[PDB]
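Sample 3 of the quickstart, ligand NAP:
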Amino acid sequence: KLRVAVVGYGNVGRYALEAVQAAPDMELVGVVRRKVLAATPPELTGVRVVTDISQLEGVQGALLCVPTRSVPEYAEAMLRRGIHTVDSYDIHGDLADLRRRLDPVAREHGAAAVISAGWDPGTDSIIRALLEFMAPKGITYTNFGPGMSMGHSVAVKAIPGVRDALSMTIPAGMGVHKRAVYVELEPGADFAEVERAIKTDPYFVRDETRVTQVESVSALMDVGHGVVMERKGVSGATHNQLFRFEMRINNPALTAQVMVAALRAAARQKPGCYTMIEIPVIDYLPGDREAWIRKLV
Amino acid sequence: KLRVAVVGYGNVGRYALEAVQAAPDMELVGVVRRKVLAATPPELTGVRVVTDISQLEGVQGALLCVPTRSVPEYAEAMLRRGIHTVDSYDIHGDLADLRRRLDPVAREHGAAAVISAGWDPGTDSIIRALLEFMAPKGITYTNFGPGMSMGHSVAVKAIPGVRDALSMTIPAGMGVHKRAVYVELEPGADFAEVERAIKTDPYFVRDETRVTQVESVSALMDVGHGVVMERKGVSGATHNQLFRFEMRINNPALTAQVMVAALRAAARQKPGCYTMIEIPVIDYLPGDREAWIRKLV
Amino acid sequence: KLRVAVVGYGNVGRYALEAVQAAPDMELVGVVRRKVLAATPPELTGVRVVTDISQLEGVQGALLCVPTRSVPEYAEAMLRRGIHTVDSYDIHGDLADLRRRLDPVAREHGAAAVISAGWDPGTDSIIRALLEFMAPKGITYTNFGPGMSMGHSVAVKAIPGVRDALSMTIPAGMGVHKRAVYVELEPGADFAEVERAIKTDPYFVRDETRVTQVESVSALMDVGHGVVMERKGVSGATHNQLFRFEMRINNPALTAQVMVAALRAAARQKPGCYTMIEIPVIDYLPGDREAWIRKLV
Amino acid sequence: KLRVAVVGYGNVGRYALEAVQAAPDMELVGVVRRKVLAATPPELTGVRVVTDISQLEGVQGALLCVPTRSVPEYAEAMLRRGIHTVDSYDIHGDLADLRRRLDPVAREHGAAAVISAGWDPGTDSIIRALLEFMAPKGITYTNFGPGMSMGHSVAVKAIPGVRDALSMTIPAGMGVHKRAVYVELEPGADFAEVERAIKTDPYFVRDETRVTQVESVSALMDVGHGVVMERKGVSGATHNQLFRFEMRINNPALTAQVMVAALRAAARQKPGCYTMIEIPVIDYLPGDREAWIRKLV
Amino acid sequence: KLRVAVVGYGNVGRYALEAVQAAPDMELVGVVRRKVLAATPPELTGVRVVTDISQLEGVQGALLCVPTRSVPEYAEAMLRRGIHTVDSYDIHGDLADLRRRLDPVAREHGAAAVISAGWDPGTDSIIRALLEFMAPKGITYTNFGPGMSMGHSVAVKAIPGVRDALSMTIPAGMGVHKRAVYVELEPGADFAEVERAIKTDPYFVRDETRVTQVESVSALMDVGHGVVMERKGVSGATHNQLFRFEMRINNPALTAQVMVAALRAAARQKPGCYTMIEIPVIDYLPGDREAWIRKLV
Amino acid sequence: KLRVAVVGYGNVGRYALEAVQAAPDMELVGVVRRKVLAATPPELTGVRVVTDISQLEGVQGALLCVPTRSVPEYAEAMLRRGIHTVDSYDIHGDLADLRRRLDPVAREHGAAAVISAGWDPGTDSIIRALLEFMAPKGITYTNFGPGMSMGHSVAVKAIPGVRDALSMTIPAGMGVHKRAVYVELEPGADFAEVERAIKTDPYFVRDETRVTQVESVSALMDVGHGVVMERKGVSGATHNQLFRFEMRINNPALTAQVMVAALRAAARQKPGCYTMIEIPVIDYLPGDREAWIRKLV
Ligand SMILES: NC(=O)c1ccc[n+]([C@@H]2O[C@H](COP(=O)([O-])OP(=O)(O)OC[C@H]3O[C@@H](n4cnc5c(N)ncnc54)[C@H](OP(=O)(O)O)[C@@H]3O)[C@@H](O)[C@H]2O)c1
Ligand SMILES: NC(=O)c1ccc[n+]([C@@H]2O[C@H](COP(=O)([O-])OP(=O)(O)OC[C@H]3O[C@@H](n4cnc5c(N)ncnc54)[C@H](OP(=O)(O)O)[C@@H]3O)[C@@H](O)[C@H]2O)c1
Ligand SMILES: NC(=O)c1ccc[n+]([C@@H]2O[C@H](COP(=O)([O-])OP(=O)(O)OC[C@H]3O[C@@H](n4cnc5c(N)ncnc54)[C@H](OP(=O)(O)O)[C@@H]3O)[C@@H](O)[C@H]2O)c1
Ligand SMILES: NC(=O)c1ccc[n+]([C@@H]2O[C@H](COP(=O)([O-])OP(=O)(O)OC[C@H]3O[C@@H](n4cnc5c(N)ncnc54)[C@H](OP(=O)(O)O)[C@@H]3O)[C@@H](O)[C@H]2O)c1
Ligand SMILES: NC(=O)c1ccc[n+]([C@@H]2O[C@H](COP(=O)([O-])OP(=O)(O)OC[C@H]3O[C@@H](n4cnc5c(N)ncnc54)[C@H](OP(=O)(O)O)[C@@H]3O)[C@@H](O)[C@H]2O)c1
Ligand SMILES: N[C@H](CCC[C@H](N)C(=O)O)C(=O)O
Ligand SMILES: N[C@H](CCC[C@H](N)C(=O)O)C(=O)O
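Result:
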C-alpha cells in the first residue's frame, strides 16, 4: 500500500529495491537516478526509472540511498514536497544536529523523517540503548569487522583519481579499529595525493589507516560485514552482568531492509524528525499490532 | 524525582529495592509486604515498610514484584488508585490478553501500565522484534539456560508440601528446553503427589520435566540464568543473514533493573497499558533525550 | 572462453547463471528450461532461453541444475552430444555407481563429466579425503545445519499434494541429524498421506523426520546452510590430531560456484567421468597454473 | 609395497619412520643419516641405518626430512638415481622455482618429485585453492600458532653460537604474525650478534621478531602447532560466504604423515615435479580408488 | 564454630562479611574498622563493629581485607595476638619473601597465616601448579580481563588528588596486558601530576598504561573480572597437550570467598605461614574429609 | 634419584616409562611384566624387564599401570614390600573404600600410596574441589569426550570372545554421557553374548550404551580424550559466578605423567593412603619449594 521510491541506485539502493519488492505493505513506484541511460540494467526491466521524484506517481515515502554527505540536501528536498524520508546517514558526530535540522522542515511540510536508520547507526543504536538501561553502570564496546564499510568506501571513491576503492574495517578489540583501504587508481592519478586525501578525511582521521594501491578492487571486495557489541555492567547494585550481540551479514542488504522498516514507521509518526530509538519497535513491523504482541513478546 | 514503591519483597523485590535506590531519577518511598514483623531485615533498616500502599507518601509508581499469577489483581488495584504499574508477568500465551484487560482500567484512572517487563518477556521481546524486521523471512530461536527460572520456581514453591524448590531450565537447542526441578519437601509429604502436580502445571505441561527430591535446595540454587537468541534469515531477497544475542546474568537482578526502566517509561506514556515493544526505547533512559541520542545512535 | 549453458533455472540454476557471468574464462550462451513463457523474468532479459540445448550456439559445457533424480538422464543426453557436463548429484549411496555408468558414455563421445560437484558431495569430499590421509586412523564427523537442504526440499516438492516445501537439517552432533519439514499443502491434499510419503522417501527414511503443515513456506525459508566437519585422529603413530572445518554459506550460491569450477576442470580432462577427488585441485582454477602455485602453495 | 627410505633422522624424520611403519602400502627399507654412531637409539633397533641411500635395498621412494635449505641438493641427488622424492620445502617465496628446477631432472630420470608437501605448504595449500574457487572474490587469511615452526627453529639452530633454539609463531590476526625466539647460547657466543643474525635471516626479516636467551630450550619446547585459515568471499555474485579451517596438531607428526601420502602419490605420477595442488586428492589414499569414492564422496 | 573477624570494610571486606555469614563452619564475631560513625550502614545493623580486634570475643581468625601494601603490618599484629590470618596480598614478586617473614612470627605465637589467598594469587596459583606437573615442558599463559583490578584501583585511589579511580586490565594475549585507568580528580588537582604518579607506580611501571580523567568513576565501574589460563605442553614425551581454564566472576566476591576457605584451612595447619599451593586442597572444604572424597574424587 | 618401576606395560604403562625417563628427580630401574618374550620391543632395548619387582634393584616406588580391577591386589603386594605406590584406579563409587583399605597396609609397612591419581579421578578431582570451595552453592558438571575411555576399553577387552575393543565416550551435556563401543570379535565368538556382557558391566550399566561390531578397532582408535568441567554458583552471597575448565589431551599420556607426579608426592608423605586432594599441590612438583612459590603463586 505505502507508495515508495528508491533514490540513488548504488549498493544500498539495489538491495533497497529488493527489500521494497518483498515488503507486504509497500509498493515500488520507481527509482530516481541522476541519469537514465538507454541501456536498461536487467533488474530494472519493468521498473520506472526517472531523474526527478515528481515524475513518479503519488510517492508517499522515499528511501534516500545516496552518499551520506549528500543526505541532508536530499532529505530536505523530499521533505519540502511532503514525502516521508529515510536515510542511513552514518556520521555519529553530527547526526544529532541533522535531526534538529530536519525536524522543523519535516513538521512544516506534514511529513516524517527517520535518519541514521541502518544497522549502525540504526538497529545497533537500539541495542546500545537496551544494554544501557539493562545495566546503567559499566562500559559498552562495539567492535566492527572484518568487513566492508560502505560509508568509508564511498568517501574514498569520491576522491579525484580514484577509479574504485574498498575500505575495510578490522576490529582491534575494546572498541578500537584499524582501517585498510585498497585503491584502484585512474591512469595519471598520484598515489601520494590520494593517500593524503584519504587520511585527512574526517572518516579516517581518528583511526590507524593504511592505504594500498591494487590492480583490481572487485577481486578483493566482499560487501559482507559484522559486529560484536559487548557490555559488562551493573543491574541495580549487581555487578558483572554480561551481554553480547553479534551479526555476520551482507552490509548493504541489511541496511536497505532496515531502511524499509524505518520508512514503514516514518509513515506512522507525527510530522517531524526521528532517530530509531525514538520510535516504538512495533512501528517497524508490518500490519496490526496485536499479532506481533502474541508472536514476539 | 519519581516517587516509587516496591511491592513484594522476594527475589526480584530485593533487587528492585537496590535498582530503585541506584536510579538517578527515582525516590523509593517504601516497600509493601503482606506482613511486617518486628524483626527488621538489615537491608530494610531505614526503609518504610507497610502492608498497604496507601500508607506510603504520594506514590506515583509501583513495581509489582509478586508472583506472576498474582500480577493481574495487584495491577488492577494499583491502577484503580492512579498508580503507574510495571510487572514482569511471564506467561507468553496470556500477556496479550492481560494488556487488553488492563488498558481500559489504566486509562480510566489516568495511569499507565507496562506489563511483562523483565528480560523475557521484556527486553528479549524488543530483540526478537528487531531480528524480525531486520530479516523478515526465516526463523528465530530463543534458547534459555542453563539457569534458574524464577517463574517456574515460584510455581513449584506454591505447591502444597513443597518447603522450597529450584526449577532449572536446560537448553536442548533449536528452541527446545528440558526442565529439572529440585524439590525440598515438607516433613511427611507425598513425593509422587508433589511430582505429579509439578509435571501437570501449565508452566511444565509442554516441556520434558524431571523432578528430584533433595535435602537442601539452597545448597544447589544459583539465581543466574542466560539466553542465546539466534536468527538465520532473509534481508529483502538476500539470504543467510546471521544474528546472535547472548546474556549470562543474575536473573532477578536484571529483571528488577528492567522493571525500573519500564516504570520510568510508564510515567511518560499516555494513560493505558503497554508491552515493551510499544514504547520508544529512549523513554527507558533517564533524563533528556538529546544527550542519549549523541551517546547511543 | 568455454561456451557454457545452464540447464534448469531453479535455485541452483539462478546462481549458476550469476556464477558463469562472473567467470573470467567462460561465456554464457543461454539457459535451457522445460518451457519458455512470454513473460521474461527480469534477470533473463538479454539472455537466450530455449527448451533444447541444440538451439544454443556452440555449447561446450553444461551445468545440470536439475533435480538430482533427473541427473542421470540429462547427463547422458548431454554427453551423447559431445558436451562436457557437471551436476551436483547428491545421493551418496550410489554416486559411485552413476560415475561407472557415465564413464563409458562420456569416453565414447569424447567428453568429460564431473558428477556430484556441489559442496557435499563435492568440496567437502576433497576435505574428507585430506583429513583421511593427514590422520589415517580415527573417525570423521560431518555435521550439517542448521539450514536448508536443497535436495531434500526438491524431493518433498515432488510429492503429489505439496504446493511448496522447506526441509531443514538440524545437527544432533556426532554425524547424526534431525530433519524438520515444513509443507504448504495443495487445496484438498491430505496431510497424513503427504506426511507418510515424506517420511518414507529414501531421502528421509534414514533420519528422524518431523513434518509440519504451515500457511507460508516462503516466510520461513532461507537458503543458507552450513557444516562442521571434524576429525580426531592419528598421524603416523601420534594420537589426538585435531582438525575442524566449518562453513556458513548461501547453499545454492556456493553449489553453483563449485559447479562452474568443476566444469572448468571437466573441459581439461581426458574423456570420461570423474568425482571431485579424482581431479587435481589446480584444474579448478582459471588460467595458467604457474600463477596459482606462487599465490597458493 | 613401495620400498621407502627416510633421509634425515631429525624431528620430522623420527615421525616419518613411524608414518611409514603404519602405512599399509609401504615398507621401510632403512634410514639415511649423515653418520651412524655405535650407540643405536632404541627406536632404530632392527632398522637398517646407513650414510648413503645406495646401501639400502631397492629403494623406490625417499622422504627428504632434511633442512629446507638442503632440500634442492638432496632431491636432485635422489632423482638422479631414479628415486621418487618428497620433501616439505617450506619457502613460499620460491618453491615454484624449485619445482621448475626439479621437473626436468625428475623427468629425465623417470622419477616423480612432490615438493613442499607438509601441512603448509602442503595440505593448507589445497585448502587455499578450494577456498579460492568456492568464492573467487575476497581475501583469505592464514593465521598460524601459537606454536613451534620447525623451519624457523632449524634456521636459528644453524647460526654459529646457538646450542639449541625454539622459534614460536604467534598469530597477530589478519594474516599477521609475531615471532618469539628462545635461544640456548653456546659457551662464549655473543647474544647481540646471534640476535642480529636471527632477526636478519630471510626467515625472520619479514616478521616482528623478538629473541630471548634462556637456560633451557627443552623446558619450553612443545612441537605442537596450529592454524586458522579464514575466508569471507563471493560465490558467483553472492557476498559474505564464510569459510573457516582450523588445526591443533603435533607439527612434525602431521608433516611426516603428509609426506608419506605425497610419496604414495609421487609413485603414481608421470615423471616430473609437482606441488600438492597438481595431484588428484585420491592419489594420496592407499589402494584402489573405488572404495575411497564410496566412503568419502 | 570458628570465631571470625573481617578486618577492613571496603570492597572485599563487604563480600567477606557475606562469605563468613554463609559459611557453615564459622561465626562472624565482628568487623574491625579504622573508624565507626554513629550512622550504621544497613548491612552492618546487628553486627559488632569496633576499631580494635581486642574488643571482639575470642576471635580465632581474621580476614585481612585491607590494602595489599598494608597487609604485612596487619598480619604481624594479628599473628602476635595468636590470631590466624588470611589475606590476598597480590604482589607476585614479593609474596615469597612475605611468607618467609611471617613464618616465624606465626610459629612463635602458635598461629597459622595463609597469604595471597585470593583468586590470583590464590586459586589460579594452584591451577598453574597443576598445569605445570600435568605437562612439565612448555609455557603457561595467564590472560586477565577485560575487568577491574581491585589491587591497581586501590593504588590509584591512594594517590593524592584522586577522589576515586577505576583500573581496568585488558588482555592483549600471550600473557601481555594493557591497563586503562579512569580517574576522578579532586577539585583543583593537577592531572598531569596524578597521571605521572600512576604510570610510575610499581603496579603500573611494567605494562602499557593509559590514564583518562572522567566526571564519574561510579558510572563506569563494574567489579567484574575474569581470566583465561592456557598451556600447550608436554606430558612425558607426548607433545601438544592442551589445557584451558576460564572464569568470569565478581572479583571481590570470589576473593572474599576464597579467603574464607583459606582461613578455614589456616586453623587446620601447624603454626606457620603458607601460600595456597602448600595446603592440601581438602583442608579448604568444611567438615569431615570422607564425604568430600566420595563427592569429588 | 627416586628409584621407580613401571608395572604393567600397556597403554598407560608405555607412556609411564617415558614420563619417568623425562622426570628430573626419578630413575627407571625397570619394567615389571606378566611375561617377558625373547623378542624385545624396540623402546625397551636397554631397559630391564622382569616378571617380579623383587628382581628390580632397590625400587622405592612403583607406578601400577595395570587394569583398574587389578589395582587393589597389586597395590597391596607392593605396599607389603615397603614400596610406595601410585595407580589411576577410576571407579568413583569405590575408590573411597579402597583408600580406607590401603591406608593401614601402607602405614604398617612404612610406605605411602596415592590412589586414583590420573586426570579423572585425579587432577580433575582437585579442580572440582577448587570450584567447590570457590562457589559453595551451585552445581558442577563434568562433560567427557568425545574420546577414548581407557578404563571402559580395558573392561570390554576383558570379555571372552573380544579380540580388541574401543570404548568411546560422547558428551550429551549437563554431566550426562553416551557410550559407543566398537568390538573386534574373535573367530567363533557370539556378538549377542558379548553385547550382553558389555551392557551388564558396572562400567556400562548407568549410561546409554551402543555396541557395534567392526573389522578393525585400530583403524578407528585414537587415544585422545578431553573434558569440559563447568560450574555456575555462589561466592558468599554473590550469584552467577562462572567457571570453566577444558582439556584436549592424549589420555594415556596425561595419566602416566600425573601418576609420576603423584609418586613424587607419595614419597614425601607419612606412611598411609591418599587421594590427590589430600596432598598439597606443591608436593607434586620436583625440587625445593621456594622456586615453585616465586614461579607459580
Ligand atoms: N548502517 C548504516 O548507517 C549504513 C550502512 C550501510 C550504508 N550506509 C550509507 O549508505 C551510503 C551509500 O552507500 P552505497 O554503497 O550504496 O554508495 P554507492 O554505491 O556509491 O551508491 C550511492 C548512489 O547515489 C547516487 N550518487 C552517487 N554520488 C552522488 C552524488 N555525489 N550526489 C548525488 N547522488 C550520488 C548514485 O546513484 P545513481 O547513479 O542512481 O544516481 C550512487 O550509485 C554510504 O554513504 C553509507 O554511509 C549506512
Ligand atoms: N552440494 C550438493 O551436491 C548440492 C547442493 C545443493 C543442491 N544440490 C542439488 O541441486 C538440485 C536442484 O536444486 P534446486 O534447489 O535448484 O531445485 P529447484 O529450485 O527445484 O530447480 C530445479 C530445476 O530443474 C528443472 N527441471 C527439469 N526437470 C525437472 C523436473 N523433472 N522437476 C522439477 N524441475 C525440473 C527446472 O527448471 P526449468 O523450469 O527451468 O526447466 C527446475 O526449476 C537438488 O536436487 C539438489 O540435490 C546438490
Ligand atoms: N609444513 C611444512 O612444509 C613443514 C612442516 C614442518 C617441517 N618442515 C620442514 O622440515 C624441515 C626439517 O625439520 P626438523 O625439525 O626435522 O629438523 P631437524 O630436527 O633439525 O632434523 C633435520 C635432519 O636433517 C639431517 N641433515 C642433513 N643435512 C643436515 C644439515 N646440513 N644440517 C642439519 N641437519 C642435516 C639431520 O639428520 P641426520 O643427523 O640423521 O643426518 C637432521 O637431524 C624444516 O627445515 C622445515 O622447513 C616443513
Ligand atoms: N586475587 C587476589 O589476590 C586479589 C583479588 C582481589 C582483591 N585483592 C586485594 O584486595 C585488596 C583490598 O581491595 P578492596 O577493593 O577491598 O580495597 P578497599 O575497597 O579500599 O578496602 C580496603 C579497606 O581497608 C581499610 N583501609 C583503607 N586504607 C587503609 C589504610 N591505608 N590503612 C589501613 N586500612 C585501610 C578500609 O576499611 P575501613 O574503612 O573499614 O577501615 C578500606 O575500606 C586490594 O589491595 C587487592 O590487592 C586481591
Ligand atoms: N584418569 C584416570 O584415572 C585414568 C586415566 C587413564 C587410564 N586409567 C586406568 O588405566 C588402566 C589401564 O589402562 P591401559 O589402557 O594401560 O590398559 P592396558 O593397555 O590393557 O594395560 C594394562 C597392562 O597391565 C597388564 N595386565 C593386563 N591384564 C592384566 C591382568 N588381567 N592382570 C594383571 N595384569 C594385567 C598388562 O601388562 P603386561 O603385559 O606388561 O603385564 C597390560 O598391558 C585402565 O583400567 C584405566 O582404568 C585411569
Ligand atoms: N562504523 C563501522 C560500521 C559502519 C557501517 C556502515 N555505516 C557502513 O558505512 O558500512 C565501520 O567503520 O565499518
Ligand atoms: N569417566 C570418563 C573419563 C575416564 C578417564 C579415565 N578413567 C579412562 O579410563 O579413560 C569416561 O567415561 O571417559
